[PDB]
Amino acid sequence: VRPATNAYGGGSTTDNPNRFMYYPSHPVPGTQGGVVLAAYSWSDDAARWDSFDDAERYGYALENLQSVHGRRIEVFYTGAGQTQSWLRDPYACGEAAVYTPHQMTAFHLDVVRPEGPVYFAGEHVSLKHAWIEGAVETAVRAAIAVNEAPV
Amino acid sequence: VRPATNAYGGGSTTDNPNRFMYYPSHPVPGTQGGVVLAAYSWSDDAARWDSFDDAERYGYALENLQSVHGRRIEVFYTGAGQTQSWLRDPYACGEAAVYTPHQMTAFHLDVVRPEGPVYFAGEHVSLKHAWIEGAVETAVRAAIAVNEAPV
Amino acid sequence: AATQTWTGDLAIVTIPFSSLRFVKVTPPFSYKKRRAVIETHYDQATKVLLEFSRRWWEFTEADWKRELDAIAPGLYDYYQQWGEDDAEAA
Amino acid sequence: AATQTWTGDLAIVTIPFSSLRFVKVTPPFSYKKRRAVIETHYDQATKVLLEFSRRWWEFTEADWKRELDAIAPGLYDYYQQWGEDDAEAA
Amino acid sequence: MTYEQLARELLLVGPAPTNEDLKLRYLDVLIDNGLNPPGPPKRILIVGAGIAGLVAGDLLTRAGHDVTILEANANRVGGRIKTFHAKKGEPSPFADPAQYAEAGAMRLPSFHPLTLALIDKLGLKRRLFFNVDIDPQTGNQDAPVPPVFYKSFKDGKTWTNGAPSPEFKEPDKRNHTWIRTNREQVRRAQYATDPSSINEGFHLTGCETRLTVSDMVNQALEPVRDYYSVKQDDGTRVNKPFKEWLAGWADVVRDFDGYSMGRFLREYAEFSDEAVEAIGTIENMTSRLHLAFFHSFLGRSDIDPRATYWEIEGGSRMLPETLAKDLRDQIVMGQRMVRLEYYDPGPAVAIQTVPE
Amino acid sequence: MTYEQLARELLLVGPAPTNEDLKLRYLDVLIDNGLNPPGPPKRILIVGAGIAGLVAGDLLTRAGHDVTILEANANRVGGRIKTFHAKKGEPSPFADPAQYAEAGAMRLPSFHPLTLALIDKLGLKRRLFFNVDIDPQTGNQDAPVPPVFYKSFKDGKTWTNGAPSPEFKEPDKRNHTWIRTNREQVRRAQYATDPSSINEGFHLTGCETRLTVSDMVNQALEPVRDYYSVKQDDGTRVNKPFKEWLAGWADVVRDFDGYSMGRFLREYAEFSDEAVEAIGTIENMTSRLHLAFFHSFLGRSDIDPRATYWEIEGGSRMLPETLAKDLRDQIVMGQRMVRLEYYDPGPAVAIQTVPE
Ligand SMILES: Cc1cc2nc3c(=O)[nH]c(=O)nc-3n(C[C@H](O)[C@H](O)[C@H](O)COP(=O)(O)OP(=O)(O)OC[C@H]3O[C@@H](n4cnc5c(N)ncnc54)[C@H](O)[C@@H]3O)c2cc1C
Ligand SMILES: Cc1cc2nc3c(=O)[nH]c(=O)nc-3n(C[C@H](O)[C@H](O)[C@H](O)COP(=O)(O)OP(=O)(O)OC[C@H]3O[C@@H](n4cnc5c(N)ncnc54)[C@H](O)[C@@H]3O)c2cc1C
């Protein structure tokens, strides 16, 4: 029987398909429960759950969760879960841009370059990929160029 | 207006998202039509269509097809299409195993090794990945070991 | 409306290149800009979220037997007998 | 039946490692065998298939006007006027 | 010359003459003034109502311009910043209607000035995101949140959101969380004092065994950190004098961009396959392993070892949805760009969209 | 010693003493006799009714064993060998009920003996798969199909399906198909005589411009082919004498396994980014570019430049579905393995499955 976790915030690491699990940093006020990021993984780790559809995933997720915290947790499981796959999202078409070796020096300077009256911004135009800071950072930069741009 | 293709069999290459298109090597006897592999791509090229769901894909597929053969083809399009995504298949969970650099020498010999009474076979156990030959090749090899195995 | 056209003098494209890959463009962006759009790899990631009646992960061992036996008679020991499966997907 | 157990003396596992990744196993396979199952990268691929009334790709230019004008009056020239969009997703 | 140019982009450094610190200019335009001289008011097409779009579309609108923000999604803005929460009029994502969780972005680094300050300016409350489990009976979070603070590589210049709050102190972190690998399971506190146990699980032999995967990685990065910065007797680091701090990074771009993170740990840091296995497992670098060394190196959570993470009260959505209240007239939902025609000498832009 | 072991696995070579040619043994067991001495008849659990499973489950059943083939799919066997076709009782995949196409495997190489012969043995008709567009008024395909033929690295030994058919001759290939890149579009025949055009489209400058991407790649592989084989005055290649032909490949494993196909074309073959761009585009190596050099190198469609491809009449499904007619009692559909318990000293196996 898995020991009481007794942990506040943070998260744990594992080699089971769930990989990383995070616990709520603060509890929603006025509530007795909470939602845990049972499974969160990138690349191939993620490529896995991508095989299964939204609805199926919850099963394993709970099992792999029990493998680390104990079968016992199953009692509090409300039976409600949510899953977000970014490769399957026709609007994100992926989590974020992440260069493979050499790509940056191969064409990143061309990524930022505007094309005629067309300007580019967003997470990927920066060099702080998979971060909002990159997004914002390039958003501003974009507005600066078009703002003072010769009409 | 794109020139008449006038090609029998084979297929064409392009940088539009369709990438590779193949034409039927032989026509189904007794028919006046045919189905073309409008779009077929691996890895990231494939990762793209993976963003869209089954039903949506047919649109672009036809457009990118027209970009190479002409808008004209649209007349013969029956409006019927089929799409197979292997990452989205909960039974294939991908097209085939394809090693990233160093993986083979890192653990391929351990891939073939049986574990107790458990034996492994299939496309990935071989070294002819993404091929049936690998599959079969390792299937036989498997049956040979279990066959003469001390009961 | 089947379609809808917009116009201006300047444009800021903020969609990810993976999505821009399917937009028809003209004239063609600069050769390198295109390659970057064809070649920029977008990594995949999936999150799975489960809801719990209580914040068990906060629990101590006492909290567990306490909280657990509250739901039903001798439910704590019921799971102690059961134990933990030895099969992992690791 | 919620479940169903099988038994034998030997076993041949032919499913791809991507799928085996979700099977609970015991005892644990050899360390390296596990890593290979956690780490073997499965590439993705998608095929899109479109159906056509005719085998146009076989067509010659004559075949086109011929075959095309057959469907409806002066349909051949209709597309010659139309031409080809200049926007590509390349 | 492309290497130096990259370092510039990486570092946010202007052109050779002045070598302006762009983080300052952006902080300026986004937090302080806004677009300074509102140039020739023009018609502007912004595709995508993600954070990038909403921010530019807002600065530009506020500076008098005809801004239109085309968004493919029909019901949500924010893009990769989504949050599950009960939506007035339909079923709540979870049994408890008051619960919510992140489907995308969830934590904001202290060293991310723009976003931090941006969240504040919009009058959004930001709580502490616990990257490591903490001892809930320590630190004082009820004090007013400390302000955003930035320090430029340019001779002692900075930037802040406002007056300090020495009353505020982050809870102390216990590592009572788990690391379960190879059927073994221990707490993070333990693994810290003695990595032997679980490292052996990955078959680490000898020297490597007596180090945590982290330090193993840090140890491996020092030689590179050396390109641009310099080790400090006290055990810290200070970037070399600009000229070198620039040429160094440009050198890092020339030397390690052709390295996948794995091929680097392996061939360059001469780590063993087992070491890379443990490393990639304990701190997600297994799946990335074959991706560019840079993506993993920049992320390097070092720099500010005492930095802090944050999270927006109510959800990550709060940030994009607040910016959206403003651009109420600019944003057009359910419209997917499918065609893009622009005019280039050597109306300027036409974008065709389909209904979603 | 791990390198040599890999070459063995790659090459299909038995242990050091004899150095048996495994392709022969497998051809033997699968086509000729079958499992020779049907050892201690035992109870056997085979998971997966894909081609691998169906083949082993068939050899083993035919040799008297209690075989059970557990298959997660509820309506289809064949796995990654799927074919869209009208299914007695429901809507046809295409408007014309007689049409069908491959969702997975579609072509079989001449140098793939096992599968080719296997298809024949099962009494399946196999037509020629045109990897390159052809001139439909050439060659004679009505002649009986040539038989499978294999040649071992072992002193002039071979293997065939049967009597030759010198009447059979493959159609001549025209390259009237297209290559449309960078808005330019030309036929393959043209690109062949003059790669300049579309190569410049990728910005290839100078020498590189006057070569097709293929040859550019072949040119790049020669030095490696040299590890194991030797160039031939006539412009062909013959593997070195076994001892070296083994140590060579083992060397190829030691030297290029740590190379992604791209990092090889780039750093080793010293190709320019534009060259790699054209190459990766014209012959799908752009998406793979960051995957192991080996996966791309082995595939190397060279070896048999006069080889041939094939396709099963009626669909790829024919192969797995025929093997399935036999194992009618062994195969169990709609059952997904979820648990696997086995006993290992230092019933033997229990597999739990869920209904699909
Ligand atoms: C799982 C996950 C976790 C993350 N965690 C963090 C974290 O903790 N901290 C952090 O700082 N960052 C995190 N990020 C990254 C951060 O969220 C992104 O870098 C940032 O939001 C990207 O903003 P963007 O404006 O560039 O693009 P996006 O937010 O992707 O927005 C692009 C917009 O364009 C729209 N669009 C796309 N194509 C079209 C089209 N053809 N026509 C019209 N509209 C279109 C989309 O619907 C979308 O709204 C995470 C991302 C993911 C996926
Ligand atoms: C798009 C595409 C194109 C291809 N083109 C070619 C080609 O032209 N020529 C060629 O030779 N090869 C080609 N291949 C590769 C070839 O098809 C495969 O290498 C081969 O079929 C793999 O056989 P397998 O028996 O190893 O595995 P699979 O065929 O994948 O079969 C595994 C089986 O296990 C089942 N299964 C999985 N998990 C479980 C579980 N937990 N419980 C129970 N059952 C389970 C599956 O449903 C499946 O039937 C292609 C593959 C793809 C994806």
Short mmCIF file of N, CA and C in Angstrom, two decimals, chain E residues 67 92 303:
data_model
loop_
_atom_site.label_atom_id
_atom_site.label_comp_id
_atom_site.label_asym_id
_atom_site.label_seq_id
_atom_site.Cartn_x
_atom_site.Cartn_y
_atom_site.Cartn_z
N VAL E 67 -7.76 48.42 -36.73
CA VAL E 67 -7.39 47.05 -36.45
C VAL E 67 -8.52 46.04 -36.53
N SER E 92 -20.47 22.06 -16.62
CA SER E 92 -19.15 22.44 -16.13
C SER E 92 -18.22 21.29 -16.46
N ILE E 303 20.06 30.45 -14.13
CA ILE E 303 20.06 31.92 -14.01
C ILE E 303 19.60 32.41 -12.62
#
